[PDB]
């Protein structure tokens, strides 16, 4: 790249992160209309995957995607600088051996359509989306083959992504992402015990509860009445845990979740020696994203009126049929061998501060340099997926 | 230490578990008693009190004098209605007949607060709060209906107790209603029921009521708002009613109505 172009790229990193987290919070509010329970997806993975579809789209088909992802304010000198933004960021996530992240995407395209190699190579090289021709007319075979590809790339952790295939299918976009991190200060499994968890004010369940002692950053929003706790990972990533005060509605906060709100929390953080009680959990969630994306203004591409003619010249009638994301997140005690910090003594009038996550909570996993929101989630019951 | 939904010997209104005990709390304008369980009316605007039309029911009236929607009082100086209703006319006047015939109380609406996540297309979050120029004189001029906390509504009121759908004739009329789960209701109404709406079975078509009508439920001598009636599917002729799930808007109520 040129001098001014390299300038544009790094300058646009913050802006891309901010917009993608607002895209994320908007998509969260859509998902919440259909689901009350456990919830996790990846704003980054979705934006990466959908931005890949712009390579083939022209006109409103393309423009709506760009607006829907909150990316319209980015004006690059060359169109290809936006994909290079995504290429740089995902490669840095990859290079982090310390970060236990697995991510990828597929574009399963009906065999009628002659996929141009420009799209084919650029989608792989920039977004690592693999275009794979498929015969959907033989639906049961397409199901087995597609599931094979995802099986391979996830090393068996997602063995059968697909349950059903419409033989009328034109294009299916799949984004998968799996993560289990290592904490910067680990929990001691000797102190992990079965504690009560309030599914709600009238319903309790027993769950494994991890115990952590040392220096942690946190803050308390006096307006919304919620605690925000930073749990840093190895590999330059952090989980923010958002815990509403006891008589409050965790679901209610989602309407106010903005990039700006999170930033206000982050700069009001104070670090102190304290105790953290936090449940072990695993989430595995898949969503049909295309209808949710429609409600965020990404419409033409999921219609017969889509223009992906650049993606392939062959006709009748190239649109996207489905867009899937499946997200797997696991949390346990494991971390790097940090030395344990000293808590303050227990006196007659006080003991160390404590945040006890024994009721439903939200979490956000951020990459630290960029601020990119890799995971946005909600745990209402840690004993199920 | 746990809040027992199966029993009647615990809190009267709301409950909160933890420790090895449970802290009871009350609805709007009620004092927590000496026994830490009962809720006694304290303020003049003690919510949800009936006697022997309805203290909380109001009509929305336009500049020409035409009534177009219904609404329910939820605070001394605030009425809740649908967003569609609040956006139909620029100058809206709330009116009530409670404790008045040819002389209803008129009150001008100084501000309109459409929900921040209202979307006309999808029909999500179709509510608005209307601030009154002058507060209602409780209890003689009127009374607000209680707004329940989330879990209380969704585990104690709606699934267990029979409800009352009350409002103004579309062209006060009250009928009992009961809960129908989303899977069934979606197929009857040919829609997808969201987490912020739910369905009531009705012995009469939905078009019987005006937009802005409400479902209420009694509990230990107090009436709680659980639903608001807005845009009905399939013409509003079906014997099920799709209402907005009020229990999910408690934070919005506070954020707006506390200024
Ligand atoms: C009606 O309002 C009058 C005047 O404020 C009040 O004195 C009276 O108690 C009310 N009557 C009833 C039956 O609500
Ligand atoms: Cl889904």
């Amino acid at each position: 790249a040129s001098e001014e172009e390299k300038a544009w790229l790094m300058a646009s990193r913050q802006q891309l992160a901010k917009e993608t987290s607002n895209f994320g919070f908007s998509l969260l509010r859509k998902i919440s209309m259909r689901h009350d329970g456990n919830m996790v997806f990846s704003p980054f993975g979705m934006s990466l995957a959908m931005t890949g579809l712009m390579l083939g789209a022209t006109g409103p088909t393309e423009t709506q995607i760009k607006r829907g992802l909150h990316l319209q304010a980015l004006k690059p000198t060359k169109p290809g600088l936006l994909p290079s933004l995504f290429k740089g960021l995902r490669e840095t996530l990859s290079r982090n051996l310390e970060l236990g992240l697995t991510q990828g995407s597929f574009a399963f395209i009906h065999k009628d359509f002659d996929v141009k190699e420009t799209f084919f190579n650029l989608s792989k090289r920039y977004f690592d989306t693999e275009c794979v021709p498929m015969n959907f007319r033989n639906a049961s075979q397409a199901k087995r083959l597609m599931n094979h590809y995802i099986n391979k790339e996830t090393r068996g952790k997602i063995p059968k992504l697909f349950d059903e295939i419409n033989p009328e299918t034109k294009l299916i976009l799949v984004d998968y992402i799996l993560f289990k991190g290592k904490w910067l200060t680990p929990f001691d499994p000797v102190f992990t015990e079965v504690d009560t968890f309030h599914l709600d004010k009238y319903k309790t369940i027993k769950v494994p509860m991890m115990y952590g002692a040392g220096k942690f950053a946190s803050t308390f929003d006096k307006n919304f009445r919620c605690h925000v706790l930073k749990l840093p990972y190895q590999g330059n990533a952090t989980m923010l845990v958002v815990l509403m005060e006891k008589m409050g509605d965790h679901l209610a906060l989602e309407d106010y979740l903005t990039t700006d709100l999170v930033e206000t929390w982050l700069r009001n953080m104070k670090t102190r020696n304290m105790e953290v009680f936090f449940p072990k959990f695993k989430l595995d969630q898949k969503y049909e994203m295309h209808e949710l994306l429609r409600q965020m203004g990404i419409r033409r591409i999921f219609s017969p009126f889509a223009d992906l003619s650049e993606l392939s010249a062959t006709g009748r009638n190239l649109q996207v049929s489905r867009v899937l994301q499946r997200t797997v997140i696991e949390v346990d005690e494991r971390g790097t061998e940090a030395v344990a910090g000293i808590l303050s003594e227990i006196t007659a009038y006080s003991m160390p501060p404590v945040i006890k996550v024994d009721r439903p909570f939200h979490f956000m996993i951020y990459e630290e340099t960029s601020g990119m929101l890799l995971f946005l989630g909600r745990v209402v019951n840690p004993t199920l997926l | 230490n746990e809040c027992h939904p199966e029993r009647t010997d615990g809190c009267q209104h709301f409950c909160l578990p933890g420790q090895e005990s449970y802290t009871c709390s009350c609805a709007q304008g009620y004092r927590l008693g000496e026994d830490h369980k009962q809720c006694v009316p304290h303020d003049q605007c003690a919510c949800g009190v009936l006697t022997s039309d309805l203290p909380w029911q109001v009509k929305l009236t336009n500049s020409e004098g035409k009534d177009f929607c219904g609404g329910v009082i939820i605070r001394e100086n605030f009425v809740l209605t649908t967003a569609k209703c609040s956006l139909l006319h620029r100058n809206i006047t709330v009116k009530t007949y409670f404790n008045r015939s040819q002389d209803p109380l008129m009150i001008k609406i100084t501000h309109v607060h459409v929900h921040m996540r209202y979307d006309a297309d999808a029909g999500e979050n179709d509510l608005s709060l209307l601030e009154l120029e002058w507060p209602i004189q409780c209890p003689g001029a009127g009374l607000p209906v209680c707004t329940p906390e989330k879990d209380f509504a969704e585990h104690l009121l709606i699934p267990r107790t029979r409800g009352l759908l009350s409002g103004w004739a579309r062209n006060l009329t009250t009928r009992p209603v009961t809960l129908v789960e989303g899977e069934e209701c979606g197929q009857v109404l040919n829609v997808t029921v969201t987490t912020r709406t739910y369905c009531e079975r009705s012995s009469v078509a939905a078009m019987h009521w005006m937009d802005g009508s409400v479902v209420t439920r009694e509990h230990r001598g107090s009436w709680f708002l659980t639903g608001v009636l807005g845009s009905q599917p399939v013409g509003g002729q079906a014997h099920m009613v799709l209402v907005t799930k009020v229990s999910r808007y408690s934070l919005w109520f506070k954020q707006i109505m506390n200024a």
Side-chain angles (χ1 to χ4, degrees), chain B residues 164-180:
Chain B
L164 285 186
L165 174 51
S166 75
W168 314 102
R170 200 180 180 79
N171 58 320
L172 203 68
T173 173
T174 304
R175 294 288 160 76
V177 293
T178 67
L179 172 59
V180 177

Side-chain angles (χ1 to χ4, degrees), chain B residues 51 98-100 139-141:
Chain B
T51 181
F98 183 83
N99 203 11
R100 303 289 295 184

